[PDB]
């Protein structure tokens, strides 16, 4: 009836990770503004390392005349847009590294498991830093849009506008992902509950490392469209690889680059890895004939 007892708490995870999570403000001029900065959109960001590199969502910082980063300790910075990637909806920011910067705990050896308790940390509706608790509902989710699918952690940790670009962490404080999107599909007009997505941390890292190295993310481009044995070529793919190879639409591609092609997704990934300008074999079955065409890859067209 009296308590020397200890309340179940995730405060430790909070104390470890929260300081590294920042408030990102996208400020823009308005014809209305008449020379006065106004907040277009706002969200969150994660301080990845002490050099002052910050991860956030691209849609948070799009078309910004100024980007402001606010730390929980009071410090305010103006940030440099290192680069962004529409495909992953990621963007990297840079800030003054003098003194000390808090960093988000990362553990590359950690395997996120379905059912893991996670906290979402961000700045919903600009109320200030909010911590919500949920679990990992799923992994490898395509998201709301089937096409151009990307791996997503799904979580029922409450996510609202302002949470974008913020962190998802486990009870140990380790970064699990970057909260990006929530599901709103009408489906009879009701409101979807407890369904939000995060870019997995491993992907976040790789993309950040590529945006710091180059102003953008560099991928190989074949310029074809098709749906999932073998794969069918539907897209016109005009110019570039399609012209260089003179590919014929309506054909099925058995294998490419000393590797099998059962699923287009595993294939599309492979295509992106390869450097731009390289030429490799493509195996298609046209009229039940094993035809082979040489083709030059090129850097993925900017979005």
């Amino acid at each position: 009836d009296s308590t020397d007892e200890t309340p179940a708490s995730y405060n430790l995870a909070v104390r470890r990770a929260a300081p590294a999570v920042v408030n990102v403000y996208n400020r823009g001029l308005n014809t209305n503004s008449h020379n006065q900065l106004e907040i277009r959109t706002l969200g969150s960001g994660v301080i990845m390392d002490q050099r002052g590199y910050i991860i956030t969502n691209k849609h948070v910082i799009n078309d910004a005349d100024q980007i402001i980063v606010a730390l929980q300790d009071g410090r305010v910075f103006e940030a440099l847009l290192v680069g962004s990637d529409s495909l992953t909806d990621l963007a990297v920011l840079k800030i003054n590294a003098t003194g000390g910067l808090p960093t988000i705990p990362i553990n590359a050896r950690r395997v996120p498991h379905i059912g893991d308790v996670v906290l979402a940390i961000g700045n919903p509706y600009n109320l200030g830093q909010t911590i919500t608790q949920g679990i990992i509902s799923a992994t490898g989710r395509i998201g709301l849009n089937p096409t151009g699918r990307q791996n997503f952690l799904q979580t029922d940790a409450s996510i609202n506008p302002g949470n974008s670009g913020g962190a998802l962490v486990n009870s140990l404080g380790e970064l699990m992902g970057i909260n990006t999107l929530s599901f709103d599909k009408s489906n009879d007009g009701e409101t979807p509950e407890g369904i939000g997505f995060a870019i997995p941390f491993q992907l976040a890292t790789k993309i950040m490392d590529k945006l710091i190295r180059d102003g953008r993310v560099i991928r190989g481009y074949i310029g074809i469209g098709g749906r999932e044995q073998g794969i069918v070529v539907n897209e016109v793919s005009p110019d570039g690889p399609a012209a260089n190879a003179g590919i014929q639409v309506n054909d099925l591609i058995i294998s490419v680059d000393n590797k099998p092609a059962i699923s287009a997704l595993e294939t599309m990934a492979q295509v992106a890895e390869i450097r731009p300008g390289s030429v490799i074999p493509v195996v298609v079955m046209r009229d039940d004939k094993q035809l082979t065409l040489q083709v030059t890859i090129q850097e993925y067209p900017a979005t």
Binding site: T147, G148, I224, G226, E235, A264, L265, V271
Partner: peptide, 4 residues
């Protein structure tokens, strides 16, 4: 449906 998938373009790459």
């Amino acid at each position: 449906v998938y373009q790459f």
